[PDB]
Amino acid sequence: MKEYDVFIIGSGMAGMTIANKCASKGLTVGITDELPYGGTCALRGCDPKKVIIGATEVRDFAKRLKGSGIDTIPKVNWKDIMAFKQSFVDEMPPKVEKGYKRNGIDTFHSSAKFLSQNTLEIGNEKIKAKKIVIASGSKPRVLEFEGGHFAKTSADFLNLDELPKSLLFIGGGYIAFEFAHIAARCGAEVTIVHRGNNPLENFEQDIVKHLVSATKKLGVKLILNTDVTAIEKADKKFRVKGKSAEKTEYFEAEAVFNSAGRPPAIFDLELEKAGISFTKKGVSVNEHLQNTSNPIVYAAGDAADSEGLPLTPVAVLEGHTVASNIIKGNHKKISYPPMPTVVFTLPTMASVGYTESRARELNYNIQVNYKEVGDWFNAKRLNVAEYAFKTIIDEETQTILGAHLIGPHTEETINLFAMAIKTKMKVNDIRTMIFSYPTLASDIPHML
Amino acid sequence: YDVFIIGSGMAGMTIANKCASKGLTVGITDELPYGGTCALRGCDPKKVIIGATEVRDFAKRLKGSGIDTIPKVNWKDIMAFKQSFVDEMPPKVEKGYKRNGIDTFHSSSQNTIKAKKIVIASGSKPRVLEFEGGHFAKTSADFLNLDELPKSLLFIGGGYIAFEFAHIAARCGAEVTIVHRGNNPLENFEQDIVKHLVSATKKLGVKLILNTDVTAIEKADKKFRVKGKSAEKTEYFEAEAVFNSAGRPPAIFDLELEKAGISFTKKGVSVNEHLQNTSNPIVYAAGDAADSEGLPLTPVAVLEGHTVASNIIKGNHKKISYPPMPTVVFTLPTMASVGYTESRARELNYNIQVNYKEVGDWFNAKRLNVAEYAFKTIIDEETQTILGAHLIGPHTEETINLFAMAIKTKMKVNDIRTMIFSYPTLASDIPHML
Ligand SMILES: Cc1cc2nc3c(=O)[nH]c(=O)nc-3n(C[C@H](O)[C@H](O)[C@H](O)COP(=O)(O)OP(=O)(O)OC[C@H]3O[C@@H](n4cnc5c(N)ncnc54)[C@H](O)[C@@H]3O)c2cc1C
Ligand SMILES: Cc1cc2nc3c(=O)[nH]c(=O)nc-3n(C[C@H](O)[C@H](O)[C@H](O)COP(=O)(O)OP(=O)(O)OC[C@H]3O[C@@H](n4cnc5c(N)ncnc54)[C@H](O)[C@@H]3O)c2cc1C
């Protein structure tokens, strides 16, 4: 058969990071992906989404200054932005292929299961390897209710030839809200059906409520405390059944979307046939991101049950660590800096570090600064109605435990709270800092 | 009075409000409405107007790529929008001053009303241009008060305001000229970066005239003819309005400084480490009015305020300390800098590593269809910390502050590389720049 130094399942951010890193320290590298090389982020995730959001920002901005110095609000041309998006998606796989060829990396284009501890079924073949890496990331949750198969994926949303006239999103996290915001701004009826009491349960609700507000003003119907129990095909539309505490509601839309959590993409690998430990949260890893059982097996990114948030940069960070323990031997212990996250709605919400309740749960002595500040210059000049913050400061050290933002540019500003946390910067050293002005960053000293 | 303050600017307001809260008697005077250059005739009103232009600019980068129509700026309606900001501010300063037992006065020897300690916070004024016809040239405040936009505009200058205003006017549909005396525009800034703003500014339909001294302005009908001499010719330039964009001397030359023995230069009131005058020790200065190590920025005016306020309140216990002072040119694309230029870090004999790159191909420049994206970082080799960073492209006005925090925190290069940033964002390009 073929022996390999490293064999990697999936050429995503974690797969690319290890493949490139190991191949340039001389090792023989075999990588396989069932889909074109790139990963969820580059082809069907963050990048394509952010491109699309581009044109909506133009529309949103023109709308905000209407009759305040702008007369015509542009309508988004759905056709042209998909093509623009596509030029980014189409270029990335050949770009990762070009690099794999220039690095002595064997490209395989087939799915992968374990046959044994150190062997894999790649199409027909039977590739053994010295160290094997699981970097499969996560997949859409299979909806286990009558009609579940009618619910299109996130990938399908980003590949729409035409924008449907109405869209329902089954979910209550970041994807449901980002895709609702895009759909509505491009001129469709949108509904969001979420099973929980609170949308974006993970985020500080004193921030989330302002996003719910903006989301209603946009013409997006938020349905809470509802389990979808069916999807039926009524002509070329869909009739969605939802059950709440007593009553039953039906909802019609030209397209229904699966916006649920994403389980780790590890359940079809025949893990058990290789003695590899796993949970419902993904591949079980130790402090070296080495499997807790089979020590030839490493995992990184969404496919690993780590303390890492399911974020592109985390997948890279975990990538550098796995590749290091492979190339040199188990020396490096994974260390997480702050993990800032963004919901790419307009207005954006951003969060880094602990929530109020999380910091109390950990018995930290805290100070809380929450403030709605829509009347601050930065919100008023851009005519953005929702601007609010919540900062969590440790009373003992006078450092930041966490920051939670909604308003203009929070996706950027959240990174200054990230750096303040990582550098253990005292609250008074941020207050007396000089920022460029007028800028959103320059409001940070007023948030403390 | 305990404290008497000349000018309710950012420095004036800061010292006034700070002293008044500790139980001191406070007297302040301006001459114009209370607020200062930034709030009423500077940064604030300028940023409001730039908003409308960002819409037009953005709806045009994505022209044919998801946007079909490019909106025209309504000069009247954004003036009105700008004016609502400016008009509501001075009554808001009264409400603060009155709610703290501060005496408001609205008029222009050693300590002559007399008071125990006196503060000079007069800020800066437009340079009086002293050539035949200099008076025709309107102030930058007048640009921000224009009822109507002229059809052509000429800017005498090579600094941030000349370019910021040229960008606005061009985007609003006007033929625009910059006449600069110097060899290079924006001389203080890294030229490896400035050259990219030059490129974009010409692509905008702006004529940049270099190495030219303006010798006259002549007013024929509702036009003006500007005369300009180089090493060769005396080229002439015609425009419905000419603007004074030349540099702002400190606003102290008409206060009769010599009548109080108070040290000054042409660069402003001479101050010590306490921001107390090097001669008269009853006199403190803050802002554009002080010849301090502080750049002429709003936040510097505030920082200098809090030091003067503290030395006055408890006695001379605090020596002014400057953090990194990031500055921005609010053109599109924006230009940003903080800390040392390459040549300045060499002048202080730092052993330096320099990272430059033009990166208009990177995802963040490419997805926004911004052609100009470049950076230049200056790293001290010994400590592996950032001495300076210099940026042009999308969001540099926001991103430059991360370089500021990195410098203040003596953050090692490798810890910026290992940081996790929100993605996709402009901030997440920082570790690639390093
Ligand atoms: C719509 C969407 C938007 C997102 N937006 C953001 C955002 O803005 N910011 C952010 O930080 N994160 C975002 N994320 C998350 C981000 O995409 C992931 O955290 C990151 O891409 C995980 O990368 P990975 O390397 O772990 O997996 P991926 O990068 O997805 O790579 C896994 C690869 O494995 C392949 N594969 C899977 N199973 C097998 C198998 N059995 N055999 C062979 N190949 C297999 C897949 O085809 C895929 O190419 C988003 C995700 C989605 C879905
Ligand atoms: C067009 C422009 C754009 C700018 N943009 C920016 C920017 O984007 N970012 C930034 O950080 N900085 C910017 N600045 C700089 C900023 O305006 C100043 O640094 C800031 O105003 C400093 O405040 P100050 O207290 O020193 O002066 P000011 O607040 O300007 O001065 C206070 C007041 O003193 C008054 N005064 C003058 N003489 C007398 C007198 N004899 N008696 C009584 N009162 C008097 C004046 O009327 C003035 O209103 C800009 C400046 C201009 C002109």
Author numbering:
A (entry chain A): 1 to 448
B (entry chain B): 4 to 111, 116 to 119, 127 to 448
Copy text from the publication.
We characterized GbsMerA, a mercury reductase belonging to the mercury-resistant operon of Gelidibacter salicanalis PAMC21136, and found its maximum activity of 474.7 µmol/min/mg in reducing Hg+2.
Crystals of GbsMerA (35 mg·mL−1) were obtained in drops of a 1:1 mixture of protein and crystallization buffer (1.6 M sodium phosphate monobasic/0.4 M potassium phosphate dibasic, 0.1 M sodium phosphate dibasic/citric acid [pH 4.2]). Whole residues of the two monomers in the asymmetric unit could be built, except for regions 112–115 and 120–126 of chain B because of the unclear electron density. However, this His–Glu pair is substituted by Tyr437´ and Ser442´ in the corresponding region in the GbsMerA structure. Without NADPH, the side chain of Tyr174 points to the isoalloxazine ring of FAD by forming T-shaped configuration.
